[PDB]
Amino acid sequence: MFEARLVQGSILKKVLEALKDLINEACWDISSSGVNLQSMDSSHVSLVQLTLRSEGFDTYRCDRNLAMGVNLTSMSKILKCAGNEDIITLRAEDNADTLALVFEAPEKVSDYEMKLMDLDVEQLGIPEQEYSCVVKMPSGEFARICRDLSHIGDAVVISCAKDGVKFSASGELGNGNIKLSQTSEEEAVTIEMNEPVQLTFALRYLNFFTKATPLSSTVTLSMSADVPLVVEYKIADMGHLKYYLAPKI
Amino acid sequence: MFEARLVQGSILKKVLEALKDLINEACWDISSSGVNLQSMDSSHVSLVQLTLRSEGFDTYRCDRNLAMGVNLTSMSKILKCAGNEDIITLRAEDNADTLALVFEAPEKVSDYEMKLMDLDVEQLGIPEQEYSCVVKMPSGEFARICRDLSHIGDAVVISCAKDGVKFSASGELGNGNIKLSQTEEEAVTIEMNEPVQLTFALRYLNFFTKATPLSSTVTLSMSADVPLVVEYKIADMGHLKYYLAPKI
Amino acid sequence: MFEARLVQGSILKKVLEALKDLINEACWDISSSGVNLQSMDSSHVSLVQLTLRSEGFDTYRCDRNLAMGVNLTSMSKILKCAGNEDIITLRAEDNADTLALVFEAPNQEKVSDYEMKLMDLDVEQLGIPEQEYSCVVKMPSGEFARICRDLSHIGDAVVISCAKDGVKFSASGELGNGNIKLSQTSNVEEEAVTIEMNEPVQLTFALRYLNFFTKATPLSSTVTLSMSADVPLVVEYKIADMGHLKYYLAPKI
Amino acid sequence: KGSRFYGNELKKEKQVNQRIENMMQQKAQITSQQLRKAQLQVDRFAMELEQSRNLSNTIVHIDMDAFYAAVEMRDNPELKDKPIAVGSMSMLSTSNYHARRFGVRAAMPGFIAKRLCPQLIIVPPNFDKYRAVSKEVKEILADYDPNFMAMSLDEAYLNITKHLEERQNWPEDKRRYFIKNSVVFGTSAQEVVKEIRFRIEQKTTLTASAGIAPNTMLAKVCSDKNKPNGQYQILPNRQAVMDFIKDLPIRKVSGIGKVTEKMLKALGIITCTELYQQRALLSLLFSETSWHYFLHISLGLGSTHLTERKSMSVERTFSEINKAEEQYSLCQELCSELAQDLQKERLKGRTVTIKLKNVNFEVKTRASTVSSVVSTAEEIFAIAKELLKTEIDADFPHPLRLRLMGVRISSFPNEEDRKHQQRSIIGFLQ
DNA sequence: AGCTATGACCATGATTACGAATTGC
DNA sequence: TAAGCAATTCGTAATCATGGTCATAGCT
Ligand SMILES: Cc1cn([C@H]2C[C@H](O)[C@@H](COP(=O)(O)OP(=O)(O)OP(=O)(O)O)O2)c(=O)[nH]c1=O
């Protein structure tokens, strides 16, 4: 009998506004320590991994491990009905095919029910390794950058060095070069550079990554060589939302 | 020489933007009682009843008793040309088929001379019933409840008991079962006689709730098997009532 | 070489926003006096003219009077990648195929260098010589955008008449002639609609273009219109004392 | 007879007869006035076709004589006077000329023909030998023209419009070979082909038919005229192309098969003169490219001057399956073997199209295009298991009873699109 | 609460993809 | 119990890029 009371409703609205454009279905693992999500999209280019652990929920309880497949556009149509303040009470029984959302306004107690499905997402992820360049930057600027090179081309060149990091794109209308130079309290640019690494990615996934922008204001880009780019947002006191993307050539 | 000068010009704007979606042409009955309209939609289910009294028109003058047929789309596209702080002067003559409008601004007047038409009028009366339940709820909360219920299905089952008014629906995913309990111009008041559970269709209530910016609060008026009234009261001008019929 | 730094980095995000659906290729005569542009559009009736002179720039150097063939749609797709309060520097070599744009934020940590591939065309420098007018009307900008977006729901032609006491914007249609009447202002911010005249004017214009011409409305807060007989309507915008932007459109029949 | 195969060809017979009646109902609704503007247009375009009917070249087709059987017969000296059959008890590739007259043909099962000849041998082929005996012949063919165009492993369009003129000033031992000197071959256009056939004969220990024509489609049928170990020739003159274009069935031309045969038995066509006599009928009735093909096969027109890979598939048939795990596991072997064969040419595909066949014989090609280029045995299988998933679970209470699955990499990229090769994520995951 | 920004939702050609059918070797 | 590859044809239909509209919110 999974049961989860979240006193800040806009966290769940923001998460499933982030994940509905890139992937379109998910298979949530809900176990005794939090909610986990592991999903690669259709083209098998990106991966999205998500953990919200069982401590920033204002109440959480679960008695047996559940696997819950969810159409994310159906859940993003149901969760469009809460306001920005509804205490959201997701309940779900174990062997029933419906997830009962119960909103609660701060007595307008809605009660929505959704159908699940049988989805078998792949039960594998990137093993734990070490990374070479770890930039940490303001996430409004990262979203502005990933939405400011798609007007040029569909290839971004992230060239990372010690003084800063440079984003360049070259397409049929020309080319462009944005250079980040390191800092002098959350406009802070910290570059844990080791080896200067130059890579190239697809912007049609970097624009879908930047739809978790109001989930934080600090984003960590973690790169290496022959290894996917990591973009990470931290949902405050809750957990994280990571995006892995594969490079070109 | 009919002249009707209204000083809160946003009233007619919110009315006609609530009417141009549903019905196409309609009849304006112009008398000493004020401005009257009863019309049906183009699918013959909903019944629009607009009543404007003569007390709060800032100057009224209506000698004969006229009837003016208008196409509401052209009338509303003229009623998207004035600010929310203007003085409306509606005008008509018996020597012309032109409904004149003048928008006065506190130094930009706006003259319009809209065409009328000639429709074949239908004066249908409403026998007044004694309603089983009349509820009063703030207008925005009803607009939110219908507009968020429209994504779930189309068969809204409005239920009513003395403790609570209980909207249900269904659809291809599951029933969005909204409640509202018994509860300061933003309260919910339930005048109940017998418990009601009656079906309606949301795809016209969505056309109804675009009269939400008229009043702060709406009143629903219901009886068993009688078509319901959804009433949005302009303060001290009249009201705008919508009639919908239950299904099955 | 040519390098030009300009501190108001929003003016090129608005001058090159009022000119992306109207025209699509133009001739930036970059010379010692400053940036110009002249372009009749894709229908060859409306004459855009634009001037950013030298003394309003932050810094500015060139001696080779070059003539860049600039694609305005792609250039607006690049200038829509800058912040509002940035600082914009233009860079060009002499025999250059490309042109470099520099967006420096005042936060100074982020700097942007875009590089735009040019083309080459020849445009008609159909010179507009010194004229004298009949009526001038100096008015708010949101008001003019509101008036034209009102009358474009009624009809699709506009009679504009100017007399001693003000202006009539009269727009007949299939559903009844709209009419909006404006008068002067005596002793009052932006509300002043100052209308001066030597002889009255009744001209007539179209409304497919006055929903394009008042796309320049965030560039200023007062537009001016000028009119006479057998001379086109002059729709003038001023920029932050760097120069101006004129649109020209002719009467009908 | 009354087989499942008979049932599906019965349904296909119903469908082609339904299209026959749908054509005859559109055939009756034209008049003698609808045979005017279309006829004038197609014969104006035929005037634009036939006026520049350029045939200064001499195109040679060179088939073989029961190729898959003959290359076995150059490597099996025991039974040279016997009828041989390659394939197995399901399908025959091609059988030899000691069995063609008896009925043992191509596209025929291993049980239909084998009940006709009780004294026969049916031996499965060796597909590695033919790829070498093709190249041995191609060594001889490259000498007479460098730009020869081998369609299959045996057919070979050659252009000898230039080699013949540069043969006139040759001595009588450059134009003379030895039996494995032997008889000197002349300088005529028949003689260069006699030389080619002699070299392919006493350099592979085999025989080879041939055919000389001014065009390609004429060569394809002239290679069938005097068929076993023989040849033929047409002269390049616009009269002499007409005397052979008559009195030909359309069971012979390639591009007019079996069903477009039966859809022309309706309109009374056997010879190409009758096929020419229906200009405004066939121009209005059939589709655009098909009436193009009919109007250019009528006058005998085509390729006057001669000219990479676009797909790569693996299909596999098996007995009846009714389980759920066996389909998911057997799609992986077909993903793997195709991933082996995809890297030998080093090609990056970006589409996987699975193709399933019921036990009562319906095709189901379910396609899926990705943006990651696909090369390896695990970057395919995660594009085809999501199509086996969509078309197993769309029969919600019932299994799939298949007999053939097959994968097909497609859309191999250019030089403009191989420099931006996006990669999959399944190379990186674990 | 209007102005403007701007992100969600929606119409909609349109190129691109899908699929059965047909032809060859 | 009736193959195994490849290539091509047309008509269906899925996805995408496009501008327009609407709602809610930061700024006035
Ligand atoms: C027609 C056909 C040929 N093949 C193979 C077997 C043949 O040995 C080879 C050549 O095809 P063909 O050259 O047309 O046939 P063939 O040479 O065997 O017989 P002929 O000389 O009378 O033309 O291709 C098939 O596998 N399947 C088929 O349907």
Numbering used by the authors:
A (entry chain D): 1 to 106, 109 to 186, 191 to 255
B (entry chain B): 1 to 106, 109 to 185, 191 to 255
C (entry chain C): 1 to 188, 191 to 255
D (entry chain A): 45 to 224, 282 to 408, 412 to 534
Per the authors:
The structures of the complexes with either wt-PCNA or Ub-PCNA are very similar and show the Pol κ core docked to one PCNA protomer through the internal PIP-box adjacent to the PAD.
We reconstituted the Pol κ−DNA−wt-PCNA complex by mixing purified recombinant Pol κ, PCNA, a (25/38) P/T DNA substrate containing a dideoxy chain terminator in the primer strand, and dTTP as the incoming nucleotide. We obtained a reconstruction of the complex at a global resolution of 3.4 Å. The structure has approximate dimensions of 127.7 × 88.0 × 89.1 Å, and displays the catalytic core of Pol κ sitting on top of the front face of PCNA in a remarkably angled orientation, with the axis of DNA in the catalytic cleft tilted by ~47° relative to the normal of the PCNA ring plane. The duplex DNA emerging from the catalytic core threads through the PCNA ring hole and bends by ~30° to avoid clashing with the ring inner rim. The long region C-terminal to the PAD (residues 535−870) is invisible in the map, suggesting it is flexible, in agreement with the disorder prediction. Specifically, residues 518−525 fold into a two-turn α-helix (“Inverting helix”), which reverses the chain direction and inserts the PIP-box (526QRSIIGFL) between the loop connecting helix αQ and β11 of the PAD, the hydrophobic cleft on the front face of PCNA, and the PCNA C-terminus. In the active site of Pol κ, Watson−Crick base pairing is observed between the incoming dTTP and the opposing A in the template strand. The triphosphate of dTTP inserts between the palm and fingers domain and its position is locked by hydrogen bonding with Tyr111, Arg144 and Lys328, three conserved residues among Y-family polymerases.
